[PDB]
From a paper:
Protein tyrosine phosphatases (PTPs) play a critical role in regulating cellular functions by selectively dephosphorylating their substrates. The ∼280 residue PTP catalytic domain consists of an α/β structure, and biochemical and structural studies have led to a detailed understanding of the catalytic mechanism (Barford et al., 1994; Zhang, 2002). Key features of the domain include the PTP signature motif, the mobile Trp-Pro-Asp “WPD” loop that in the closed conformation positions the conserved and catalytically important aspartate residue, and the phosphotyrosine recognition loop. Here we report the crystal structures of 22 PTP domains, including two tandem-domain RPTP structures and a detailed structural comparison of this protein family.
In the first category are TCPTP, SHP1, SHP2, BDP1, LYP, PEST, PTPBAS, DEP1, MEG2, and GLEPP1, which have a “PTP1B-like” accessible pocket that harbors a basic residue corresponding to Arg24 of PTP1B.
Residue numbers in the entry: -21 to 0, 1019 to 1140, 1151 to 1226, 1232 to 1303, 1308 to 1311
The structure:
Amino acid sequence: HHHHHHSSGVDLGTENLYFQSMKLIRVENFEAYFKKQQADSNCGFAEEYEDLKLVGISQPKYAAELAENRGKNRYNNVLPYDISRVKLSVQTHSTDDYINANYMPGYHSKKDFIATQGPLPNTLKDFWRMVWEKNVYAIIMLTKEYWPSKQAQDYGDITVAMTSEIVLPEWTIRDFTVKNIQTSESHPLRQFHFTSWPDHGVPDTTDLLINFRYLVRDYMESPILVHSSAGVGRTGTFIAIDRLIYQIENENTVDVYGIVYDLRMHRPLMVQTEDQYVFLNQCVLDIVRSQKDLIY
Ligand SMILES: [Cl-]
Ligand code: NI
Ligand code: NI
Ligand code: NI
Ligand code: NI
Ligand code: NI
């Protein structure tokens, strides 16, 4: 009974959704389209990106604005929308449910990812609770510590213990156990840490992002938790490329505009600069160029 179509003049956000929330390009036409869009200092891509700027930002975020939850946001202007926020269980009051995090769609489902900020000192117990309560098995950390290394640490009613650390040049892979001290139930956890993605910036090469993503997929119901400082820019770019690669492999099509549109509908600022958006397109170009008769 929830399936309905809106009349005009009811929600201008929904009208935009129906009208222009997609720009689908077949891979066979993508090199020609990329050439057009990158001309004159990326004018075409800049227009796509500026058309995305107000998407999603009219949605309510009352929980995020509660006085009780102010200390739980890193920035007073990066706030989770109510509709997609990760709601935690409650012990003492309703606001116990709050964390600056959102469910983000991936290629396969609407809860494929949780996008969140790197924990604060006062939200560290909440962050590991989320990991526990939402059955997270993979964490993706994009930066340029909230976990133990030496011995087990308790964060609230959860104990975390490190079981492996492999340091590589571009990234680190850490394994943990996450154990509810009240119930004794333990889950495994793998953390994939990309170690030089600059804030507001992009990795040094497209291979680094693509190969890191494929590392995440080869080394993994349950959400993938992605975080960065604000939980939007690098986090959104990561999720986007993952969605794009699946769309290229399974469909023969690309929709960077539509995937970022969809991200913005679930959390603010996803893919936070124009260069990150252009970078997603250069990633696609390089994937397309690498996947590419005698006459008698
Ligand atoms: Cl950082
Ligand atoms: Ni229904
Ligand atoms: Ni439905
Ligand atoms: Ni219908
Ligand atoms: Ni409606
Ligand atoms: Ni900054």
